[PDB]
Design a protein around this ligand. Structure first.
Ligand SMILES: [Ca+2]
Ligand SMILES: [Ca+2]
Lengths: 190, 156, 149, 188, 156, 149, 190, 188
């Protein structure tokens, strides 16, 4: 059953990486009233917001992550949240961790002798999911500062998190099975 | 217009939808991390059996029991497992205290688009309970049917 | 004018009746999914779990009362039943506590007249338990006397 | 005893089926204010409503499950609940499941070599109890949708639910004991 | 005159004194009845050990844990013991729900004779906790001293 | 303007600090009264109970969080500590819940911005636990490699 | 240790019986404002209330357990509570149960062969305490329908309940020890 | 190791004693509005209050633990709390218990055959921590009896409490291990 488990792990890792990359790249994260000129229904992602329908359909504008004026530096937590949202460091970190987990899976399939690599892969996947969670929260918090709705990029990210957790569990199970085989062989040889 | 009674799923009203989704994600992540820190180490194993009983299914069951304020027959014993359990317990305390503070008010809110709670205000939880009972009965019957077919195939 | 049983006011009578019915149904379904299949019995036969009808009723009562549990279900279907019962219990008990807090503030200390009914119920339950224990004892004593004959 | 357990299961199944049939057929479910022609004390059931006092005693009416209301802004959940209450599909399903459980009991009496019939009867009885619970909840919720009381047909239904759950427990125990006996015979 | 802050024992304010006395009496009676129905029957015994672990001290501990909504490692298994436990659980649920509904309001009431809770409003519970810790330390030390003296007397 | 950690508003900061201090003291005293006496050790020596300092801290944390307990004290002094800690926990948690209910109604659904801090704390705790487990694993691996040399 | 336990049980049973009898007999149950003629400070028991101090000091009047007028019957629970309080059936039942427990203790000390009698005694004591509890509640409920205080008869009854519980526990322990001795002798002879 | 445990226990005991003595002696417990002569920012300790800014920097006052209030309707509990705070008996008791625990540690170092001295030191350290907790609660409650902050003397006391509890745990473990060694030697 090792081959089936490894195929499932590889397919899930690739799917989660592709979903997270598409979610970061695309701009259909949120549907809300706004303006794309520097009010009309618009779709906004992590980097740009574009007007759909209207006289300015298809025009995209970079999102200003530091709204308001007078530069009220009364709270540092708000500035930290704005900087974290503007950088989008957590979704990108999740993408990087998914890529590293896939690379570790490939390296394990290549060497076929170092078990710890498998474990590392699993950690990455789990870590990626955790990062994903933080990003989601940050994004929603950034929307705190009219009915709105979430596009398919948000749910692509959520599905990426779920698949990353599943792949991490599968990788940990594979690691445990490899150590089971090692213990059985050691018992047989001793 | 006419007053709008709360929906069949009004028990989710006290928290926003994003909070519920984040709770589901946090539950999944906590269960996965608990299982990983409880079972990954080969030095926690002994043909060979783990020192702890925290598999993925048992981790999910423990997390659900902790969030439901019920508990189970198992509890983490390692340092990292206990860290996960304690942080999950703190999260559960905060979230459940926030959710149950004004549940009845959300259950009996009237909108345009004191009194005892009525059965109409809590019909959804009864429907969900009966549906869960039926689903469990169906799952048990399916497993029984499968095992009986496998045993019959082995016999002949 | 609140009575001796005014603590039941926050929930309607139909809610209490349906709570009793749901408790009975949950206990029965838990016992059924835990004990029916012959593949959980291994060689007087012994079951893998300990979820009989009496144990199932005890588990459901403990879960609803927010009290500790001696046993927990281990199978998939039993755990489905347990989880859905936990969800129901959380919702219902939280709603009862919220409505009771609303009722009690319609800062005056609670009086014994408002909670005399629960004391009456407790004493009646203690008497019933003592009577049941004595009946079982004298029945077993009669059986032993007949056996020794 | 196997014979005593069989007798108790059959008697309980018949009692639950009869109680459910009587409750569904009869029209003494609720006592409340209402009219019986075309506001006085009136007893109503699942189908009919009849005033028990006044100048129009006896002659009475079918329940208007879909009354001539404003008809505007009616939620789909409300219509679903109203249709479910009007059909009374859950009490009738409980009656049917109780009848099927009794039929399974009779077949097992005629087919003692087959043990899955006992399990089928137990499943039918438990399902009938669950359906009765759902029907009671639906009926009360539809009624609430100001002084009233519950008649003896509602309590007949409640007693039928309790007896059905008890008989399901007995049938499951019978199945368990039969499989235990089979295992003991094979092992010895 | 000046406002009167609640006393050091203001945590007993939500319930009347008669209720507290009746709670103490009910706790004693429940523990005694549980022990009696659990241990009186010679057919519950086996040099001979009881089937259950519900002695008088263990019965008191179980009743206190049930009333505190904490629980212990034991639970009644007999029919009568479980009846006692269930009725005590119902009593505990009702009484604790009544008591904890508006605890903060009773803790911060001002009398002549929203805001966060202050440490002054909950100093009494801290004093009682530290006193209980000291009492437990003293009891353990006394038992240790007694056992050491007995062992020394046995030695010589 | 509530912040990310607005869930700590119902209790003052001094109350939280004293709660931490009381938890530490209760755990230490429970361990002391459970393990100090040599007459609870019977013949690597094994104790009658399992209330070490780590187990005592776990028990106190579980008792304060209204969660299930793996172990319960059995001695007189240990049970005194447990009972007084249970009383303290009941009073403090009930007061926190009552004040939180008062705070939240100064019927609007709670927003994610009001409870983002608890999510941050949870994720940080998960990361810390994973780091601790990995550190222990690689330490044990290094020790085994040195032993095999 | 059997003799010490039996002496403690007998002394406790006698003390509880005497305390309950005195509490029922005496009239210093409650101190409150009132009148002892058919407002001044008065002390009232289960049966009679007497004025202390004033111009009518020492005058006792039977307590009227059915106050108000018009004989309203909208509630039967209130009439039941008033009848139970007027009868005082629960304190008297507690006294009777304590007397029966003491009689059972004496009969056991007489026969010295029938163990079940001991058990019966214990039950009586426990039962007595339960009855005592009910009476207390009823009494306080009867005071629901001006600062007040409870006299030493109320606390005599409370102490009687506590001692009754202690004596019941001791009797159950003696019963268990007797069956322990019986089992040990049976094992020795078999 | 026994020597490492000895060194850690001695270092922790000395650190806790020094922190408690510094906290009690120093006057940077609280920052709040107040006067320093006979309403400005001011740091106050257990005994003295001194304003850290203004025209009267440096020169400062003894805390009036019993201020010239109306003196009417002074509850006995309030007077008890005020007297306890004025004496600062609990911080001083914590200092004394820490010193006694250190003395017990030194005596056990000089009296290695006696094992109850380790237990005495552990009891002293735990008691000192409990006394420090009580003193902190008393100080805060008396202070509350509107913008303020806590200085580094208060945190020195808190750190002393934590270190004292840790050293008590270490001493109890030391006692347990010594008795374990004695039992192992006797058994073998
Ligand atoms: Ca619990
Ligand atoms: Ca509440």
């Amino acid at each position: 059953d090792r081959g089936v488990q490894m195929l499932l792990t590889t397919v899930g890792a690739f799917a989660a990486f592709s979903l997270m990359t598409i979610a970061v790249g695309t701009d259909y994260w949120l549907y809300s009233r706004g303006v794309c000129k520097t009010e009309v229904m618009t779709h906004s992602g992590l980097w740009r917001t574009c007007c759909l329908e209207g006289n300015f359909k298809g025009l995209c504008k970079q999102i200003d992550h530091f709204p308001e004026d007078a530069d009220y530096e009364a709270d540092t937590a708000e500035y930290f949240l704005r900087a974290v949202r503007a950088s989008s460091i957590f979704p990108i970190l999740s993408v990087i961790l998914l890529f590293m987990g896939g690379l570790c899976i490939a390296a394990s399939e290549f060497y076929k002798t170092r078990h710890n690599i498998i474990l590392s892969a699993g950690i990455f996947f789990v870590s990626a999911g955790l990062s994903n969670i933080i990003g989601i929260i940050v994004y929603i918090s950034a929307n705190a500062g009219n009915s709105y709705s979430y596009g398919w990029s948000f749910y692509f990210g959520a599905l990426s998190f779920i698949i990353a957790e599943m792949v991490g569990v599968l990788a940990v199970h594979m690691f445990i099975d490899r150590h089971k085989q090692l213990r059985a062989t050691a018992r047989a040889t001793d | 217009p006419q007053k709008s009674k709360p929906g069949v799923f009004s028990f989710l009203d006290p928290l926003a939808y994003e909070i519920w989704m984040c709770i589901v994600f946090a539950y999944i992540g906590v269960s996965v991390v608990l299982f990983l820190v409880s079972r990954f180490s080969p030095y926690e194993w002994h043909s060979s059996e783990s020192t702890n009983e925290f598999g993925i299914f048992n981790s999910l069951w423990f997390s659900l029991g902790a969030f439901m304020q019920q508990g189970c027959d198992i509890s983490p014993r390692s340092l990292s497992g206990r860290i996960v359990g304690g942080v999950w317990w703190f999260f559960t305390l905060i979230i459940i205290s926030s959710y149950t503070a004004n549940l009845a008010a959300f259950l009996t809110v009237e909108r345009m688009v004191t009194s005892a709670l009525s059965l109409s205000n809590v019909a959804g939880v009864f429907y969900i309970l009966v549906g869960g009972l039926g689903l469990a009965m169906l799952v048990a019957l399916i497993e029984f049917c499968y095992k009986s077919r496998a045993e019959a195939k082995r016999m002949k």
